[PDB]
Amino acid sequence: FPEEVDVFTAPHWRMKQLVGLYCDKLSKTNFSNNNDFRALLQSLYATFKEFKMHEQIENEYIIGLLQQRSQTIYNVHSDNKLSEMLSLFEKGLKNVKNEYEQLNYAKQLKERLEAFTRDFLPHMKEEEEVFQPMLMEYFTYEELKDIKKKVIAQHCS
Ligand SMILES: [Fe+3]
Ligand SMILES: [Fe+3]
């Protein structure tokens, strides 16, 4: 699809970049070290807040408009359980007070992150492969242009 009407690719390039960055940070992190431990969680909190902002932009600028056009039932824009990821990081930041707890938390963190990435990648792909075509259907080219302009502006603060 022409870039000027593609509402998912550019934002997703950033989202995928972020995924790579936290996977690298995660694998390099020494969960036995308190400072290393809190820095990763801080980074993760920021990263997933950006994810949360990304999903919100889509809900407010794309999904809502699209749904008020067709009304003829769903795909829904899935949650990805971002609030639950953010809640996890918070517990690690407020509740973990020693190395035993850091290492027990780590196993759960890795589990949950892997599962998240496992839900996030198909999620983005579905937007690109299913929602985008739908947009071309229910909106004119210029209407879609206008939507993308707002979407990209929101991602560029
Ligand atoms: Fe999304
Ligand atoms: Fe997306």
Side-chain angles (χ1 to χ4, degrees):
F1 296 104
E3 293 175 284
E4 61 182 2
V5 298
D6 182 338
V7 303
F8 292 120
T9 297
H12 288 174
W13 181 94
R14 169 59 171 173
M15 300 311 119
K16 295 174 182 186
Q17 183 186 47
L18 288 170
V19 170
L21 284 172
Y22 78 66
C23 286
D24 184 68
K25 195 175 284 286
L26 173 74
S27 68
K28 288 179 190 301
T29 289
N30 176 10
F31 296 88
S32 295
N33 182 269
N34 67 320
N35 294 132
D36 229 27
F37 180 82
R38 296 182 59 85
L40 161 74
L41 298 185
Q42 290 169 342
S43 175
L44 288 168
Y45 205 93
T47 289
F48 279 69
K49 297 291 276 180
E50 185 161 350
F51 286 166
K52 187 172 178 179
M53 181 55 51
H54 170 74
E55 306 301 338
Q56 180 176 338
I57 296 176
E58 292 176 329
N59 287 332
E60 296 174 344
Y61 286 85
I62 307 175
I63 310 307
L65 274 56
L66 167 57
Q67 290 171 334
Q68 69 184 29
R69 281 281 167 104
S70 48
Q71 216 82 11
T72 223
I73 316 306
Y74 287 135
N75 288 244
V76 293
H77 182 213
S78 85
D79 188 312
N80 284 345
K81 300 156 187 185
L82 284 174
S83 279
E84 290 81 345
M85 291 308 304
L86 289 167
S87 177
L88 177 67
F89 309 149
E90 177 175 325
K91 294 179 180 180
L93 282 174
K94 290 175 179 281
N95 303 14
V96 170
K97 289 301 173 302
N98 66 50
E99 291 78 3
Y100 289 94
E101 292 174 338
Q102 282 176 186
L103 297 181
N104 289 322
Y105 178 97
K107 66 195 58 178
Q108 299 178 43
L109 175 61
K110 295 155 179 290
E111 288 179 12
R112 190 58 193 95
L113 280 177
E114 278 178 311
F116 168 86
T117 301
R118 192 172 303 130
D119 278 15
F120 191 23
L121 303 198
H123 175 98
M124 286 192 287
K125 185 189 172 193
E126 196 192 44
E127 289 168 343
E128 293 158 24
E129 296 183 337
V130 185
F131 292 140
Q132 180 75 46
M134 293 185 55
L135 294 164
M136 312 289 301
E137 182 180 352
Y138 294 100
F139 293 90
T140 67
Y141 187 101
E142 287 291 301
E143 275 184 318
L144 247 180
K145 277 206 61 168
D146 299 342
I147 292 170
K148 170 59 179 306
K149 177 171 172 55
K150 302 176 176 179
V151 173
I152 195 59
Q154 283 299 293
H155 280 83
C156 306
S157 186

